[PDB]
Subunit: 330 residues, 4 copies
């Protein structure tokens, strides 16, 4: 957003820092086929230089299959085939041990008279039995909400008009040899559904495949902590990002940064392990780059640490452990 | 502090316009602090709904730790932490009612007051414990004596934290069970939710005659999850206003403050604690705020906020929130 | 000569009451007066015995006889978590914190004329349904009740299935030091473990934390699957005969049991992994303390020979038993 | 007596039943390169007819990297690269919706003076903090045991001589589009570490990729319930299997069968969800193929169901829900 970028890790360590960036338009025609698995086997759709900008025309989580409140999700969708992905985008010079920095500049709704979509998919959500939390109870009612929206507000209903706080649900890089579905978050990023990953945020992803192989998709107009019903307000967007490369920075999990905080993003089940992963990664980050002594960092976070529950519905839950940048002062 | 006029405690509390009697629950009045919360303890004080109570709480270690050279494993015996004040009896309280506890203020108690943070062996969020049973050596045994005042917590040369006090253990008695002071459950307990401080009203479901309110474990500050096992534990002068709401069936504790309402669920694994909180919030929105169930569920998937209380105690605690602006018709 | 293994049991080798002509007490409903739904040190004692004595307990079913027809509706007749009415507390002379109560179950027979067991699907309670802990918004499962005829040989489930009579105690426990835990929860004091192995021919070891021990028993099952997945087993009223003895100064953190072929550490918690960790770790500590094992060898050996029994996966805390065959205890 | 096979699902529904099978020798020379990811992108190494036999020369979980008790696992291994896989094997006619039936005939130790290996790998095991159950404690001691073995016994130590009960730790088929690492079990099979999957067992795996794409590996000379320290007695083997194909049999999870029982194998975290998955699958199996009414099956299993804890160390835990074949009688 403002001048905090000057002190960001991306600007201070990114190799593309002072470059006049080339802006690429990743349209649907360039993408050709959207992907439902994130790995090293997909044919690259674009190759960029670190520091370049990319304007992505993303598709909603249902790849436009739902367009009416009278639609029936169980008849139009097949789990886990949600979150069609743009990519893979190749970053010149990226190799295992590096980090892709993704700065989201803006996110606007795409199409004339744009609509977002929230849905209650049978056997999927936070307060229902699913195919993982296998119960014998009947699934919840099958609902769909077509919500009108603009760059300022989300028109949920007569009673509630929500602010437009867009963010990317699925942001990731390829694993070394595995190919993970677009519904799962892991140590490569993925379907994290962390509300903070929107305009004014920089997400750091660990490279494990040559070229990085950046994937993006599943834009949300807004989202609650946990994305409890299974979906947020899913919409097609024009997401503009700046991608840079940090050389030889060993990360085990995704990290992000914004004007006010730094955050370690862990993903797993049960939810406590996702939280352990995040907090422990944050502690290692504080010791490595911010001069903290390990036990002091641990005990300090027991007084100042902040937690963001991302999703609690996907194959793996996602949690972000934060620390306010004011507490990083030496 | 105008929001109190619209609070559930003021609008439904029977003690609302009373000139309250202020009781001083000193250590001499308390006699013996408790490590179990139930209906078997002898009452220490009886009050009228609307009365104020000035509680002289003891720290989580009951003063057993006073030096950074102390060794927790030699001075503490788990799970005997969080000595409790109470039980306090509310006149007229019976099963089906709710005790509303409004915290007015919290100040450090004693001359040259110090808070305490400790890494207790086999206890904490990033260590094997007696529940998450591992064979690894326990983490180093550490203790921090932190100087503090009504304005700041002097953690170190590098970090000076703001003083945001809150109560770690706030509860009412179960009908027949007696739960230890280290565990949070449907009666409240050791929730360690940072939001339960000055300017908050906590609603607890009565299941025993008289309510039997217990309080303790004051924190000068606390992170989400209380990850190392302890916050900045200190002895305090906690002033509360306790009132009674008649015939309001609650299954779990709820709280309210200037900006939000929250349902507090406690359990393991952490997902279930969160499910409990969110589901309770949804039932609360349907019952008292005119929401249709499925709309509330899908709406919270866009606006719900989550507070990770503790992720170290026998049961983890999570708060599901909704901003009061979204309660408008 | 099947009861030969008892001679080598921990109860016989270390129990203070070994060799005594035991006094047999009849814990009838008239002696019990009121059954309890919470296990702690505040209940009035109903019986005091000497270590080595026998007790014939007339237990009540998990519903305290509230259900007697397949047309009954559990949600209208039961209030959770008030299940498993308990017999006790029984006081053992000399028992104090640091000791262990050894409970050997001799036999379990169905009580009453034309006895019936009961299996039920209670709304918001069970392994494959949302509950008040695993809080879901889905409708509860159908409300079912099965009245099963039974005898000392078989459980007449249906025309198609006749199950063998393998009775065991669901709730066996001792009082905590100061807490009073409900009769539906298992913990480090024993409790509602629902471990099928705790039946005739088994000796359960419980850690004493309250003076006199304060032994509680109840919730007899005619049979039970691993996990007790629907929420209930075949619940029935029984005549359970036990022999209770006392082992002095044997520090245990969790319940343990022993039978003709194995030893087992019983852990209880949520999530289920932690219940299993507790059990296995306790077993490892037991092998190091009493059977001359080196810790890491025991750990790696159990990774090859350890056996696990899923007790319940429905109660407030799940229960898991980690076992080792007695043949592997030989030096 | 192998009389029970006549009533097995493989013999009654397998298309290859009655064929004079062709026996293939899947040697290391045929395999060329062992795989650490299971998916549809690997080049096929062998194509067989349903009913054929395959003699597989498997490699141990460490791909021979450990050969001395003085070896240091953290210096010789890189997690999660364990369990080198043989395959993919193609079954002629296999397509999505089918099931691969894998009957294990025998398993013998391979090599001169064969040795099995048990190891305590840092940050991996049931009773230690790991990278998923992220703790700050020091890892457990780094230990290795070289165990001599033969077709009759496992020479653990002077004090303990264990019986030779071999079984396959990793048995799987390819996902439709994903490629899952060889350390993870899921709905495609994988690193289940279920002791029952040995000689005299038939494992049923759901086909989701054309040709099935069968993968096998990680032979164990023995294993405890949970494989608590992280590893069993890992060894290189000569595993002989008979692979057949069952047409149009919709399965969501792996199933197995032996002389005395049928079992549904679920994999997930936390451990209760793995168990829910298994039991629910068993109930659906009993309703579909054995004439049970759903609620009766559920309540009956609450009296007769048996549970096998497979592993409680891998990225996903594995649990088997069983029912004795005597209770399947109409
Ligand atoms: Na998403
Ligand atoms: Na989404
Ligand atoms: Na606390
Ligand atoms: Na505290
Ligand atoms: Na029970
Ligand atoms: Na029972
Ligand atoms: Na394995
Ligand atoms: Na293995």
């Amino acid at each position: 957003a403002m001048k905090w970028l000057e002190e960001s890790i991306m600007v201070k360590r990114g190799v593309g820092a002072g470059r006049k960036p080339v802006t690429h338009h990743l349209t649907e025609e360039m993408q050709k086929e959207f992907h439902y698995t994130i790995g090293p086997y997909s044919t690259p759709v674009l190759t960029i230089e670190p520091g370049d900008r990319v304007i992505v025309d993303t598709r909603d989580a249902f790849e436009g299959a739902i367009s009416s409140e009278q639609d029936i999700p169980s008849q139009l969708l097949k789990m886990p085939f949600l979150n069609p992905q743009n990519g893979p985008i190749m970053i010149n010079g990226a190799e295992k041990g590096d980090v892709i920095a993704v700065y989201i500049e803006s996110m606007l709704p795409r199409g004339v008279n744009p609509h977002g979509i929230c849905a209650m998919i049978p056997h999927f959500g936070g307060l229902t039995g699913t195919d993982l939390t296998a119960m014998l109870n009947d699934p919840l009612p099958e609902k769909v909400r077509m919500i009108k929206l603009d760059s300022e507000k989300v028109y949920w209903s007569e009673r509630h008009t929500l602010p437009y706080k867009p963010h990317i649900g699925t942001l990731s890089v390829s694993p070394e040899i595995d190919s993970i579905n677009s519904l799962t978050p892991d140590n490569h990023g993925g379907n994290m559904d962390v509300p903070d990953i929107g305009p004014g945020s920089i997400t750091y992803l660990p490279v494990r495949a040559p070229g990085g192989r950046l994937f993006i998709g599943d834009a949300h107009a807004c989202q609650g902590d946990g994305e409890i019903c299974g979906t947020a307000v899913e919409f097609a967007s024009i997401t503009t990002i700046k991608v840079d490369l940090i050389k030889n920075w060993q990360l085990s999990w995704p990290r992000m940064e914004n004007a006010e905080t730094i955050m370690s993003i862990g993903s797993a089940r049960p939810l406590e392990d996702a939280t352990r992963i995040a907090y422990r990664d944050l502690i290692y980050w504080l010791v490595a780059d911010f001069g903290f002594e390990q036990w002091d960092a641990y005990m300090l976070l027991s007084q100042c640490g902040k937690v963001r529950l991302g999703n609690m519905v996907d194959p793996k839950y996602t949690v972000g452990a934060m620390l306010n940048k004011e507490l990083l002062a030496q």
